[PDB]
């Protein structure tokens, strides 16, 4: 069994549908808001297995699993403000410019945890983060081609490492400060690939100060070994936060 992670499906009260495996909102024992993912069977449950070993306040938290019933459920904490990408596009009336860097910090704390566990995300993007009722950003979908979030060594030789997560984080910062624009907005993936290899980088978004841009820019160093760690980036972000607020 999955031990204490096994949830009784009869403690769930399904309330609203959120998308379509199948994602719904509900309550667990009339008390806690949850998101519920419905469903191959063996590879679906892998997401949950990864999530049983990773726990952080900026990482979407597994609550449990229902595996003794078809279909199988995955249950997690509920993120009321949904996807970070849509939030950045549709919910600007709800956050200040200073808060953009706080969103960055939330993601950076999650990524520093993952990095310390020697665990790669491989798909870090605004689309793969979620936002709770307080505007706290959390990394999601880490239990499960993104050309626009990839460094050249990934594009050219499928060289995945901590430094490929670092590159994508920089692109995520760019997404945040550009209020959810698609990176390389006038290029196809193929053109993006070509231009990246030639050393073209994303421009400084208007809302980003020079200090902030330096932080995202450092994530895009051509040499993977020259890119910082999440530990370094977290310290860079706190520093700028102290200065710019
Ligand atoms: C069930 C699950 C298992 C493992 C990892 C993550 C989740 N998960 N899925 C949705 C949510 C949410 O909290 C959530 C709450 C409200 C809204 C939304 C949106 C996000 C984007 N999706 S989508 C993928 O259809 O575009 C629509 C619904 C998501 C959440 N925590």
Closest by CA to 35, choosing from 47, 19, 50, 57, is 19
Tokens 């706190």 locate to 238
Catalytic residue among 123, 141, 225, 242: 123
**115 and 230 in contact (C-beta within 8 Å)?**
yes
Q: Which residues pair with 116 in a beta bridge?
A: none
Diameter of the chain by CA atoms?
Answer: 56
Please tell me whether 76 is known to bind a ligand: yes
Q: Which residue's CA is the closest to the ligand 1 atom numbered 26?
A: 19
Run of H or E residues at 25: strand 22-28
Tokens 């993601």 locate to 107
Please tell me whether 37 is known to bind a ligand: yes
Please list, residue by residue across 152-183, b when 16 or more beta carbons sit within 10 angstroms of its beta carbon and e when fewer do: bbbbeeeeeebbbbbbbbbbbbbbbbbebeeb
Say which experimental method was used.
X-ray
d(Cα 98, Cα 96) in Å, to the nearest integer?
A: 6
Give the end-to-end CA distance of the chain in Å, rounded to a whole number.
49
Residue 109: CB atoms within 10 A of its CB come to 20
Pocket lining for ligand 1, CB < 6 angstroms = 18-19, 23, 35-37, 47, 60, 74, 76, 78-79, 82-83, 130, 140
CATH numbers and ranges of domains, the chain = 1-78 (3.30.200.20), 79-245 (1.10.510.10)
Token pair listed for 154 = 């990934």
Q: Checking DSSP bridges between strand 129-131 and strand 137-139, what pairing results, if any? A: antiparallel
Active site residue 11: no
Compute φ and ψ for 28, nearest 5 degrees.
-105, 125
**100 and 215 in contact (C-beta within 8 Å)?**
no
Please tell me whether 77 is known to bind a ligand: yes
**74 and 129 in contact (C-beta within 8 Å)?**
no
């Amino acid at each position: 069994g999955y031990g204490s992670w096994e949830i009784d499906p009869k403690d769930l009260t399904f309330l609203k549908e959120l998308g379509t495996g199948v994602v719904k909102y509900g309550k667990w024992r009339g008390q806690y808001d949850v998101a519920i993912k419905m469903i191959s069977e063996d590879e679906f449950i892998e997401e949950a297995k990864v999530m049983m070993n990773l726990s952080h306040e900026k990482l979407v938290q597994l609550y449990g699993v229902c595996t003794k019933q078809r279909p199988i459920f995955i249950i997690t904490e509920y993120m009321a403000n949904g996807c970070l990408l849509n939030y950045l596009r549709e919910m600007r009336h709800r956050f200040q410019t200073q808060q953009l860097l706080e969103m960055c910090k939330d993601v950076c704390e999650a990524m520093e945890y993952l990095e310390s566990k020697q665990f790669l995300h491989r798909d870090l993007a605004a689309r793969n983060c979620l936002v709770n009722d307080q505007g706290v950003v959390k990394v999601s979908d880490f239990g499960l081609f993104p050309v626009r979030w990839s460094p050249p060594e990934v594009l050219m030789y499928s060289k995945f490492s901590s430094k490929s997560d670092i590159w994508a984080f920089g692109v995520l910062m760019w997404e945040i400060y550009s209020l959810g624009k698609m990176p390389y907005e006038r290029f196809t993936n193929s053109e993006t690939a070509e231009h990246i290899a030639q050393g073209l980088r994303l421009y400084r978004p208007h809302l980003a100060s020079e200090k902030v841009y330096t932080i995202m820019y450092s994530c895009w160093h051509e040499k993977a070994d020259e890119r910082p760690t999440f530990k370094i980036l977290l310290s860079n972000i706190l520093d700028v936060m102290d200065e710019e607020s």
